[PDB]
Amino acid sequence: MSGPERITLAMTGASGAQYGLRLLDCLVQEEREVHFLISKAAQLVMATETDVALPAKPQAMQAFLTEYCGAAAGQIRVFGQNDWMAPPASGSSAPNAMVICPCSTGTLSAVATGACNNLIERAADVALKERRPLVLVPREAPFSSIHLENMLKLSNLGAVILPAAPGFYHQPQSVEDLVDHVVARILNTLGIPQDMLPRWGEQHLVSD
Amino acid sequence: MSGPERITLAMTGASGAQYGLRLLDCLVQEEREVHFLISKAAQLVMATETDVALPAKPQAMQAFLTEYCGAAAGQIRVFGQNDWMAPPASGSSAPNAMVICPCSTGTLSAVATGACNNLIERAADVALKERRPLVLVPREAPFSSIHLENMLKLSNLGAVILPAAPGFYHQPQSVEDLVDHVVARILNTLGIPQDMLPRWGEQHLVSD
Amino acid sequence: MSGPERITLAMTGASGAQYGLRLLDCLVQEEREVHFLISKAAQLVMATETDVALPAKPQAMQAFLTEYCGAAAGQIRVFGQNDWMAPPASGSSAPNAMVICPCSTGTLSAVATGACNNLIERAADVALKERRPLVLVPREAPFSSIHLENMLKLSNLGAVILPAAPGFYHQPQSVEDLVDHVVARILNTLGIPQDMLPRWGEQHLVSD
Amino acid sequence: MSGPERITLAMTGASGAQYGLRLLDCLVQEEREVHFLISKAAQLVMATETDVALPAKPQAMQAFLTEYCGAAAGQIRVFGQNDWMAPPASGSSAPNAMVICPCSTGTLSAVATGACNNLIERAADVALKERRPLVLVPREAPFSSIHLENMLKLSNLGAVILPAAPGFYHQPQSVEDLVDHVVARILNTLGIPQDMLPRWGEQHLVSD
Amino acid sequence: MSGPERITLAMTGASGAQYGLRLLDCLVQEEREVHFLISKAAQLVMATETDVALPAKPQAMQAFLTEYCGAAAGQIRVFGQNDWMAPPASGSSAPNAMVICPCSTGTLSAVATGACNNLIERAADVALKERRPLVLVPREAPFSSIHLENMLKLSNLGAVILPAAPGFYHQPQSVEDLVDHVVARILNTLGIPQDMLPRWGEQHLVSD
Amino acid sequence: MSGPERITLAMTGASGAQYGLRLLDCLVQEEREVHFLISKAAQLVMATETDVALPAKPQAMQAFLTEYCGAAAGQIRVFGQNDWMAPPASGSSAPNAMVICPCSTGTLSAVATGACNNLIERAADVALKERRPLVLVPREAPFSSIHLENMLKLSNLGAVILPAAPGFYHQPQSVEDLVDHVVARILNTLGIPQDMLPRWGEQHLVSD
Amino acid sequence: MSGPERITLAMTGASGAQYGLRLLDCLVQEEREVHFLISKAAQLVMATETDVALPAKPQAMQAFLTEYCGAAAGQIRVFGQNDWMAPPASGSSAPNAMVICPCSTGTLSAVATGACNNLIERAADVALKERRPLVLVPREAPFSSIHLENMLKLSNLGAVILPAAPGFYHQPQSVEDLVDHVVARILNTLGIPQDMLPRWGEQHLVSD
Amino acid sequence: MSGPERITLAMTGASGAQYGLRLLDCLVQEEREVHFLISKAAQLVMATETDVALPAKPQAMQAFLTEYCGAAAGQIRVFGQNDWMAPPASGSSAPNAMVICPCSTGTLSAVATGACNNLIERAADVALKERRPLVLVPREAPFSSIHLENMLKLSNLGAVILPAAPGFYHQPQSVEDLVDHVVARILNTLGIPQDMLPRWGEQHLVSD
Numbered sequence A, B, C, D, E, F, G, H: 001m002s003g004p005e006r007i008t009l010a011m012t013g014a015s016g017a018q019y020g021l022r023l024l025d026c027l028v029q030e031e032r033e034v035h036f037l038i039s040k041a042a043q044l045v046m047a048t049e050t051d052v053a054l055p056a057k058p059q060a061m062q063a064f065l066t067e068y069c070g071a072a073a074g075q076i077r078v079f080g081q082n083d084w085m086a087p088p089a090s091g092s093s094a095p096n097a098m099v100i101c102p103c104s105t106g107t108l109s110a111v112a113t114g115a116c117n118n119l120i121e122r123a124a125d126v127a128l129k130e131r132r133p134l135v136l137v138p139r140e141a142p143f144s145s146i147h148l149e150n151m152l153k154l155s156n157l158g159a160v161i162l163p164a165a166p167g168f169y170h171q172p173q174s175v176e177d178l179v180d181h182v183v184a185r186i187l188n189t190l191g192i193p194q195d196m197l198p199r200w201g202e203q204h205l206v207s208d
């Protein structure tokens, strides 16, 4: 297969819970193993913004997401916010790509400064020190200089700063079309197949 | 009235032509004078992404946008890309707020480095030196370190970097709802009334 | 009225005494209260460059400038260079805008580094810490890297660096026309009405 | 195959047109797809420095280079300098490696600052934000501090700064031998096979 | 003779066309060879601000300036904005001093960042890399932090940042006296004789 | 196979000769080709800290290490400290990964500043310019700010700074267990199989 | 006595619990007063890596460590993670030296940025502002640029960054010998007597 | 004569020995005194890349180069790599210009950091502190960020970074033509006459 076998998908408390759920669904349909992390604020966002009734505790959350996505048993692992026995907490784990989608400005700050106050932040710290893929999907507006300095520091170190800023150049007709544009960019960045966003200009052989 | 009487609205060639058109429409309905600038690439974006048939030359473009928006005669001024006789080209003009919506990464770069190769770039140079409002609405993903350094430099100088990253926390039901979220943020930043985005928590008096 | 009720006008020992005297005259005619400070070197410049016979001591200087400008009694206050009992020396004073016109490279340096060796330098230190308007009008050529670093530091902090560099785009016919161009820019920056410099392009509705 | 299937080859107006033509020829013989971009100044350089009579417009240029290189139909695509419908203009395109050979100091500057004034500059902006290979082949002497700061910024971000500085350690006998040394370095950097430059010390098992 | 035999004089689109014309006239009267460059915006400034009817195309412009200045045949060369065959485009040319008078903020930016979009910008790039004299005469007010950072970068590299800020310490009686003050500073910087500005204090042997 | 076919293993004069010898042994058992470099100080460390009687000259050293490791003929190449004919001295060599284990603070400094005083330092210079893997294993305590700045500069450029700081989270029972922890991290970083350090949490499917 | 009478010993959640326990034991045997702090993650590390059954709550933990170390009554104080009434929380306390052993990357980050989220982080903030000794013993590999920047910032301010990187130059025969090497370095840094690590070269009077 | 009477020419171990030999020959034919320094690695390069049989020790090397170049007795001085009695080692010597051609990345590093490990490095240290001409001719590809930072630091201090990157704009027909292009640039930088590279555009009086 193309791209990573395992993806750590962390959802944090920015608006845009739909991006993370749709990414999760695509990862599952591409038969990838997903190590799923979600912050307490992201649980509140998901309740506010969607009709998904996500259970609170990891074992029930795992059963629920497995059913919601049509995943195979064991395909989605869920790890709690202080579970240092989970693979993402150590660089001696098997390699994963990591995506924080959406990424709050507070989680952006923790990753940029190296805070390790929960398993999402430790997992990102591990991705950076092991030079494993790390994609952050910030959703905020305006971006202040504090946000921008934190994004710049991480981008300089090879993290991919992929804002939740959908493009309109395929004439979107629904909210779902805009969500899929951003999710397709994430999948493209990871090297994972996707058929929601065509390859720009692939059939264009010479200028008019 | 609250907020600026005059707004220089520049559209450049990032995806998201719908944001600039909807902003223009709101500015007109709030009875503001709009100095409208559009780049050659933005004209191509508008043709690709919308069904608006915008005429090419300033005088016809002015007549068209006046009709499209229901504007009063003279409310929308259109200035061409080398018209140094227009108000935005000089700091001795009457004060305007300026918005570049959407803002391409190339126009972001020109503004951050002080290039003055067309009237949009000179207008932003003037806003910064006169300390008049300047709002940039970048639409790009990922943001590279070059983008981020350019945004950081301008934000440090007081420009507002407002990415086209809509929020979902009022349960959007259409593309138009997401466009209106971003446009409402711009209007809020300018100090101009808007009724598309409620005031978060205004009725919340104490925690549960 | 528009703009500040009170302006601290400091003259320091750069060439261009005529700019400060003409600014003083305009401020008086707009019925503003002026807290007037002048350095010992600026007194020598004024004697060299003009026919104004400015008395040396504050009380006589106050009487003289009141007559020279046609000011109301008490409209121009004059404070000596170590008078820490004057309003500009403390941030607990009533708010003023401040202009140093002209600004020597030596006073530019003191303001940029926070030296507080006389009341002009302390007044600027107070403007910066209170976030009250501060406009510097440097007159020097060439500008060395030391000058430029000092100007950059202050501009980054929100001071307005307005060099004594008049524009020619209204066909000046006299020295006085060039002096008035710079003074009009200062008044525009302060938000004070002026009729010497028209609003560029105000009557220009569309490009040719 | 080893290395990228598609290469965006941009020629800009530095001396050394022979490097870009020889690279193009090698890429074609390795059966790679080439998206060919050339600046207006580079067309003047190619006329000055070589006997290649390159047609001006993209469709004729494509036919000419196809014949000149012995390429298969469709193997060389040519895109004009404002053709935003071409794959290199968008990060949603299929992935290419990109080489700017030769790279003028002016194109180096545009890439380092994020200017996007033509399709070569936008293509490089896209390579950087997508973290796709970008190789710059500057040809200039001396290198000023402005050149060097621009090269350093891009190298820090992962672009390969490969100056047109041939090596002599295989006893070159012709201009073509020196051109081939630089082209072999570019091919090595891309991961594409080449037999012009041997693998240094491959047969050396222990020190004398 | 003292000072450079050849001067590249570039005029760009800042206010102050009179400074460049008066400099040109002085250079001619000192029997210097002048390589004259003028931007399209500077042509518009010259029409706005002066009664000089400068022809548009280089050959007619050369004939006109030769007559206007009383120059010898061949003393003033005029080169168009993309003429890479002119001496200033290459560091292998015979050495010139270069002055950009006046210097727009946009040309200041291009020189500071190394953009090479026309022959004025390439000529300055060449002056810096060859360590040949480069004098910039910016005319703008206020100077923003973007302007100031660009001036500081170039001054640190040895360019002379000489703002169009005339001095008043010889009691100017006309616009022409102020223009001559700035032109005399430029000539002094180049090492070229001038008799418009006396040598300050040359007859002062001891303090009073 | 997974990971690099060839590894340049340089040992320098920090304490921890056992790490480099154990790494060499693992590389040999994974059937990798090893280009072995050792500094004069590292030879003294190996004599002090181990019972390995390493011969001084490259040909005898090669024979000895081949026997000590059970390597195939030609699998371990040894190159002397000024042998510029060896593959690591040139970027035109076949690609290797490089590890400096252990890495003295003096070799760390040389690599960070680009000193090229022996073949280890040149080899690292080549790895960085070719963007080939470079892993440094510093052993020092305390780390001063000079050490830390040198490590930071190289890590920013993509070198892996992997201190000889073993972990205890698998209950080590011997010196050899701690040495193997660090060697396993190096092998993991290179992408080479190892069975000394389990994959953390690989069997952990959900939180307790 | 030599060295500090009181040491704040904080253990945080890096691997290497044995270093902190052995340091505690040495401090007790040198009759020092120890203010003992341990994070919740460090309690989990100690359970994983050792057979020490450390009670959870401070009063029981104090009784246990007193017995485990053979300490005098009151010699070991234990303070909980939000006990702002403990001496380390205020710079008006009696002076202590402080050691964080081991130091997680997350606690390193908090100290470098000034976060004060628990008593360990506040205690370090106090040590830095009072210029009292602060020693950090990080255990991590690789060190990322985020780790390295945080270590560099603190080392520049006078904190001692002492990685858990034991030396082998006295022929260690057990895990305990390597642990004692690091603990001896810490004691040496504090100025406290130790007999585990000899004074290098103390008997060496002249070179061979 | 024009340009320096004495030139310190140092050859170091980059590829491009032919540039240094051809420069030496030109300097001799312009009747300049040459203080010739060559590193041990450069001697190996010269043997690899040329048929020049350069003797090893300074006195024989001096006799050989005198014959090879047709120099006058005493015109070429040769100084060994630790000869601190030679003029280049002290700033109290008579002034020379200095050229390092070719310049290895290792010698570039030493000069940028101030290492003074041999007479070439001390000579460059002296040139910089005395503000005497220093020209470095690096030959390397790619240039890494370490190379680029070292070149930038020195260029900022006034050293001329002149890469061995020949131009093709006079239609070179041989290796020797390309070598002569670079040597002519060096001679131009020093102010020494040369007739290998014409003065670009010297006969071009106006644009077509």
Ligand SMILES: Cc1cc2c(cc1C)N(C[C@H](O)[C@H](O)[C@H](O)COP(=O)(O)O)c1[nH]c(=O)[nH]c(=O)c1N2
Pocket: A011, A012, A013, A014, A015, A039, A040, A041, A042, A044, A045, A048, A103, A104, A105, A106, A107, A139, A140, B167, B169
């Ligand atoms: C409905 C809703 C929507 C948002 C938020 C909150 C809620 C409840 N918050 C604030 C964010 O959740 C808060 O700063 C948390 O501290 C983030 O914690 P984590 O980073 O998820 O641990 C938030 N934060 C942010 O950076 N971007 C956003 O778009 C939003 N939007």
Ligand SMILES: Cc1cc2c(cc1C)N(C[C@H](O)[C@H](O)[C@H](O)COP(=O)(O)O)c1[nH]c(=O)[nH]c(=O)c1N2
Pocket: A167, A169, B011, B012, B013, B014, B015, B039, B040, B041, B042, B044, B045, B048, B103, B104, B105, B106, B107, B139, B140, D084, D085, D089, D116, D117, D118, D122
């Ligand atoms: C349909 C379409 C869509 C986009 C673009 C182009 C086109 C045709 N371009 C590229 C952009 O237009 C190009 O870099 C221009 O050079 C921008 O010029 P202006 O800044 O508008 O003068 C573009 N650029 C960018 O920064 N963000 C974007 O989202 C897009 N999207």
Ligand SMILES: Cc1cc2c(cc1C)N(C[C@H](O)[C@H](O)[C@H](O)COP(=O)(O)O)c1[nH]c(=O)[nH]c(=O)c1N2
Pocket: C011, C012, C013, C014, C015, C039, C040, C041, C042, C044, C045, C048, C103, C104, C105, C106, C107, C139, C140, E167, E169
């Ligand atoms: C007639 C005349 C003209 C000038 C000056 C002096 C005199 C006597 N000085 C020098 C300046 O006065 C001197 O550096 C003082 O130290 C400035 O002191 P204050 O900053 O006014 O206290 C001066 N300084 C400067 O920065 N720009 C200028 O244009 C001039 N011109």
Ligand SMILES: Cc1cc2c(cc1C)N(C[C@H](O)[C@H](O)[C@H](O)COP(=O)(O)O)c1[nH]c(=O)[nH]c(=O)c1N2
Pocket: D011, D012, D013, D014, D015, D039, D040, D041, D042, D044, D045, D048, D103, D104, D105, D106, D107, D139, D140, E084, E085, E089, E116, E117, E118, E122, H167, H169
């Ligand atoms: C024959 C010839 C040779 C050269 C050039 C020109 C010409 C006509 N130019 C100048 C360069 O073309 C100019 O600055 C253009 O503006 C570059 O534009 P592009 O970057 O190609 O769009 C040039 N520029 C540069 O950076 N390095 C070089 O070696 C040369 N050599």
Ligand SMILES: Cc1cc2c(cc1C)N(C[C@H](O)[C@H](O)[C@H](O)COP(=O)(O)O)c1[nH]c(=O)[nH]c(=O)c1N2
Pocket: B084, B085, B089, B116, B117, B118, B122, C167, C169, E011, E012, E013, E014, E015, E039, E040, E041, E042, E044, E045, E048, E103, E104, E105, E106, E107, E139, E140
């Ligand atoms: C009459 C008039 C006066 C001015 C200008 C314009 C016109 C028409 N412009 C704007 C300037 O010409 C514009 O930014 C151009 O893009 C500059 O292009 P060049 O740098 O000359 O290629 C201008 N720009 C500037 O930096 N300083 C100035 O004083 C002025 N004044």
Ligand SMILES: Cc1cc2c(cc1C)N(C[C@H](O)[C@H](O)[C@H](O)COP(=O)(O)O)c1[nH]c(=O)[nH]c(=O)c1N2
Pocket: F011, F012, F013, F014, F015, F039, F040, F041, F042, F044, F045, F048, F103, F104, F105, F106, F107, F139, F140, G167, G169
């Ligand atoms: C037994 C023994 C142990 C050590 C050392 C030496 C010896 C003899 N040295 C010092 C180091 O060898 C010295 O600074 C050399 O200059 C390093 O040279 P290389 O970098 O190997 O060429 C040393 N240096 C260092 O950075 N870390 C260390 O742990 C040690 N330990």
Ligand SMILES: Cc1cc2c(cc1C)N(C[C@H](O)[C@H](O)[C@H](O)COP(=O)(O)O)c1[nH]c(=O)[nH]c(=O)c1N2
Pocket: A084, A085, A089, A116, A117, A118, A122, F167, F169, G011, G012, G013, G014, G015, G039, G040, G041, G042, G044, G045, G048, G103, G104, G105, G106, G107, G139, G140
């Ligand atoms: C067994 C074991 C081993 C380790 C860890 C955990 C566990 C359970 N953690 C992760 C660390 O505990 C986590 O990031 C905590 O957030 C650290 O919190 P404190 O800094 O102690 O509050 C960890 N962290 C680190 O920086 N270095 C390390 O060596 C280890 N090793």
Ligand SMILES: Cc1cc2c(cc1C)N(C[C@H](O)[C@H](O)[C@H](O)COP(=O)(O)O)c1[nH]c(=O)[nH]c(=O)c1N2
Pocket: D167, D169, F084, F085, F089, F116, F117, F118, F122, H011, H012, H013, H014, H015, H039, H040, H041, H042, H044, H045, H048, H103, H104, H105, H106, H107, H139, H140
């Ligand atoms: C044939 C040949 C060719 C080259 C080299 C070597 C040899 C033998 N070396 C490596 C260089 O000589 C080495 O790093 C020395 O340490 C340089 O020492 P000096 O700076 O001359 O003392 C080398 N180094 C470099 O920076 N650029 C180059 O082009 C080459 N080419």
Ligand SMILES: CC(C)=CCOP(=O)(O)O
Pocket: A084, A085, A089, A090, A091, A092, F167, F169, F200, G015, G140, G141
């Ligand atoms: C949870 C755990 C074993 C963390 C240690 O991981 P690593 O050695 O710091 O990569």
Ligand SMILES: CC(C)=CCOP(=O)(O)O
Pocket: B084, B085, B089, B090, B091, B092, C167, C169, C200, E015, E140, E141
């Ligand atoms: C178009 C024009 C008059 C530009 C000059 O404006 P400003 O004095 O630079 O603010």
Ligand SMILES: CC(C)=CCOP(=O)(O)O
Pocket: C084, C085, C089, C090, C091, C092
């Ligand atoms: C002259 C005086 C009372 C200075 C103190 O003012 P502030 O409190 O420092 O703003």
Ligand SMILES: CC(C)=CCOP(=O)(O)O
Pocket: A167, A169, A200, B015, B140, B141, D084, D085, D089, D090, D091, D092
């Ligand atoms: C030409 C085009 C569709 C540009 C937009 O690309 P991207 O989403 O900015 O990578």
Ligand SMILES: CC(C)=CCOP(=O)(O)O
Pocket: D015, D140, D141, E084, E085, E089, E090, E091, E092, H167, H169, H200
């Ligand atoms: C127009 C031209 C020949 C440019 C090349 O000049 P240079 O070698 O870059 O100084």
Ligand SMILES: CC(C)=CCOP(=O)(O)O
Pocket: D167, D169, D200, F084, F085, F089, F090, F091, F092, H015, H140, H141
């Ligand atoms: C030993 C040698 C041929 C060094 C030159 O290598 P490279 O071209 O600098 O990568």
Ligand SMILES: CC(C)=CCOP(=O)(O)O
Pocket: G084, G085, G089, G090, G091, G092
């Ligand atoms: C817990 C406490 C009294 C903290 C205040 O201490 P300090 O004055 O900030 O050193």
Ligand SMILES: CC(C)=CCOP(=O)(O)O
Pocket: H084, H085, H089, H090, H091, H092
């Ligand atoms: C070899 C020698 C006398 C070096 C001292 O020179 P300088 O005084 O440091 O310029």
